[model samples]
Target chain A: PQITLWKRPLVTIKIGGQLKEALLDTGADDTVIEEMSLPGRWKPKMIGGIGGLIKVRQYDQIIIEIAGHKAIGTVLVGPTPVNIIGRNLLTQIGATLNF
Target chain B: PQITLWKRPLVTIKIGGQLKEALLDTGADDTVIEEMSLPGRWKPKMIGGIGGLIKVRQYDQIIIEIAGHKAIGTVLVGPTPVNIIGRNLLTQIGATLNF
Candidate 1:
């Protein structure tokens, strides 16, 4: 599937058996989601963005579904202003940035 | 041209006769760059990201070259943690998010 950069390229993703609208962020290294509770043990992790550092919960072996494609990867749960889908899951879904 | 989201999708861009490595950020609405001196007049503006908002100088009529493609759009200069090329410039270069 091809998506145009009409606005913020937002897509629906299913994670942890929950559905979420996440922004496709080529700039972000990892998929960061708003603070949430999921079934799994997590480790404390920190990530930095345009603003500063943020504390998060790193959950491994998370199943993510995007555009009918499934990918299992690490997901970070934290106090982020927005939910972003990064390269970790983007590549698994065969995503490409074209011009 | 096609770019893979291998990591952060960093691309070489020429802005105001200066070259910079900018991340293609579909999550960001406007193009934000590190504070730099450019030939133009600007007005004060503010934008927010994952962490918070920051004051910036919004310059108009800036020419940007990305992947051998030329685009003219508004570029924001401020104390940004990183240089990001947003949708404003991405559209001019006929870029799309394909999966």
Candidate 2:
């Protein structure tokens, strides 16, 4: 699919058997989703962005369906302004930036 | 150009006659560059992200050459971990997300 950047590049994503909207963020290195309960052990981690660093729960081997494409990666659950599908998951789905 | 998400999608951008690397961020609403001097009047504004909000100087009608493509829009100057070319500039350059 080709998504123009006229607005926020948001798409439907399925994670933890739930559906949500997430942004395809090429600027972010890791995927960060809103805090949610998943059946797995997670590790405490910190990620930094334009503002500052924030602690999050990192869940590995998580399966996410991005725009109907399956991708497995490390998802960081934290207090993000919006759910972001970063490079880690984007790569798995063969996402790219084109101009 | 088609840029894969395997790495940080950093591109060279020319702003204010200076060349700097910026990330193509689809999640950001506004472009934020590092603190720099530009010839123009700017207004004080604040933008929020994952962690929190930060104050920045908003310079309008700024011309930026992103990856050799020219784009004119509002650019925010502030303290940022990395220069981000947000949707404002991305749209002007006809950038899109492909998978």
Candidate 3:
């Protein structure tokens, strides 16, 4: 699918057996989602954004279905205003920026 | 150009008669650049991101050459860690996300 930049490129994703909407963020280095409970052990981590660093729970080896494409990667659960699908999982789904 | 997600999609942009590299951020609604002096009066504004909101100076009718494509729109100058070319300029450059 080719998504224009006229609007936020939000897409449906399935993670932890739950469906959620996420933005395809080319600027972010790692995928970050809103805080949620998942059945697994997680590590305390920190990530930087435009403003500053943010503390988060890092869950590894997570499988996420992005727009029907299956991708497995490390997902960060934190206080993000919106769910962001970053380069980590986007690469697995073969997502690209084109002009 | 088709940019893979394996790396940051940084592109050269000419703004205010100076060249700079910026990330093509589909998740951001407006373009934000690092602190720079530009001609004209700007309005003080605020924008929110994953972590929190940021104060910025809004400059409208700014012309930017993004990877050789000309685009004119509002640009925010602030203390962002990195320069971001968001949906505003991305749309003008005919940029799209594809898989």
Candidate 4:
């Protein structure tokens, strides 16, 4: 028998407004968006994640993609750039990372 | 006698204008500025660090404060929002981090 503990990695998230790679993560445990990385502000709503529930407000209208799959997102309503990528989305994506 | 290999930790650096804690690092190794965090183009110079010779350009003209000391730093010429603070400046400031 073996016991293993898992830890998530900080992925390379490139930011810009044109049309290209937005967020690069492999089966992240949760969803993440850098706060204060956007240009404006907006209202926030509670969203679910691997750890628990977090408040989210999107801004700046950004495009996001992973495994060639993409979604348009906004700057997280928070003012901090450090955001946690949890495990909820991991189960849904059928993906995983090794690094 | 003691044997200890030093490792750096990822610190939280707050960004914004108007002088309110932009960079929050203790004896960082290199002077770093986020490439995309800046609003304009700037010509950076190569600076020495604990690592080696690093090319850098300042941009966005933001003020940074640590232990009540402050200075204006430009974004590192590189385009990655991630900036690296090496150890050369650490020795010069005669400051050490314990965290």
Candidate 5:
């Protein structure tokens, strides 16, 4: 499915059996979401953004569904200023940028 | 033309008769570039992002070409963490996010 670039390119996604809306951020290297509960142990990690470094909980092998495409990848759960769908899962869904 | 989502979804864009690479950031509302010589008058503005707000020079009526698609829009110039192609230009090019 194709998504038109609206005022904000936001999309609905299902992750860890929970539905959430996240930005389709090609600028981000990895998917980052606002901290949430998921059934699993996580790795303590930190990531840098446009502003500064942010602490995060790195969860491995999480299932994500976006626009009917299913992808299993790592997700960083943390106090992100925004939720973003990054290249990690975008590649799994064969996402592209084009006219 | 289609662009695969890479580690960083960067693309070459031509603006002000100069070529530069910028990230395709749907998260950004307006296009921003590293400070450079652009022919035009600019308005001073401040924009807020994930981290905080930053001061910028907003150049209007700028011509941008990306992968054979042409677009005219406002672009911000500032000392930025990175150069970003935002939704303003993306919409002009009819670009989309898709699987």
Candidate 6:
């Protein structure tokens, strides 16, 4: 049993001011940016994360633009950059994927 | 066209003494044991992460066994571990996933 939501199109974030972009993962609970790809002055903190009571950290808020759409949310950060773009903000944008 | 070569059964790792199984993702670069799902000794480092020119690090060699196939996978640990088993060990073990 699964559903897909990512109809707003792809969003790309510049890592360390680099033009390299990563896809957003809406299916995932917390926001997760790829490793070392985040910008300066945005150090994340380890709060109660997914893995259930495991040591994890998430950014306080991330300013992002999705296919020209922009919003701010408390995003999660990680080493992988294949953004899942989950349901957290999908409803705000009212979009879903073709999967 | 695509190929899957996982003739062996699923290999499960006990994260923090909990029995949770993760499917190995060969499409990934290194060994990525998921968020706090790894044992106590497998904390990862940031030695040149995937974001390009970013700081990320891989851990010491980790031992992984798939089905009856056991070998050492110099793994990479991340907060979100999807177990992206890449082509390296798949070829070494002479197998692939059934995907």
- Which structure among the candidates has the greatest TM-score? 5
Clash pairs for candidate 1: none
Query: How close is every model to the real structure, measured as TM-score?
Result: 0.89, 0.90, 0.90, 0.27, 0.91, 0.33
Candidate 5 lDDT score at position A88 = 87
Model 1 chain A: worst 10 consecutive residues (lDDT sum): A45-54
Question: Model 4, range B1-99, lDDT digits (tens) per residue?
Answer: 111111212333444442222232222324565444445667757654333455677554555443333444444544333444333222332333211
lDDT of 6 by residue, A1-99 (tens): 122121212455443344435443322445455455555355545533333223324655566654444556656666443554444543334433221
What are the root-mean-square deviations of the candidates from the true structure over C-alphas?
A: 2.3, 2.3, 2.4, 16.5, 2.0, 12.6
Runs of candidate 4 with Cα error greater than 4 angstroms are A1-99, B1-7, B17-29, B39-41, B44-56, B65-70, B73-75, B80-82, B87-94, B97-99
lDDT score at residue B46, model 1, on the 0-100 scale? 83
Model 5: residues with Cα > 4 Å off, grouped in runs: A49-52, B48-53
DockQ of 1: 0.61
Quick one: best DockQ, which candidate?
5
- Least accurate 10 contiguous residues by lDDT in model 4 chain A: A1-10
Native-referenced Cα lDDT, model 4? 0.38
Model 6 DockQ vs. reference: 0.03
Across residues A1-99, which tens digit of lDDT does each residue of candidate 5 receive? 778887677778988778888888877789999978889889999887557788999999998888667899999999887789888888899989877
Residue pairs clashing in model 3 are none
What is residue A58's positional error in candidate 5, in angstroms? 0.4
lDDT of 2 by residue, B1-99 (tens): 899988788999999999999998987778999998789899999887445887899999999999999999999998887899999999999999999
Q: TM-score, chain B only, every model?
A: 0.91, 0.93, 0.91, 0.39, 0.88, 0.50
Q: Native contacts retained per candidate?
A: 0.85, 0.94, 0.92, 0.00, 0.87, 0.00
TM-score of 5: 0.91
Each prediction's interface RMSD?
2.7, 2.7, 2.9, 17.8, 2.6, 13.5
Segments of candidate 1 deviating more than 4 angstroms = A48-53, B48-53
lDDT of 4 by residue, A1-99 (tens): 110111112333344442222222221223456443454556776654334456777554454443333444444444323453223332232333211
Superposed by TM-score, candidate 5 places the C-alpha of residue B91 at a distance from the truth, in angstroms, of 0.6
Q: Which segments of model 6 are wrong by more than 4 Å?
A: A1-11, A14-18, A24-26, A37-56, A97-99, B1-99
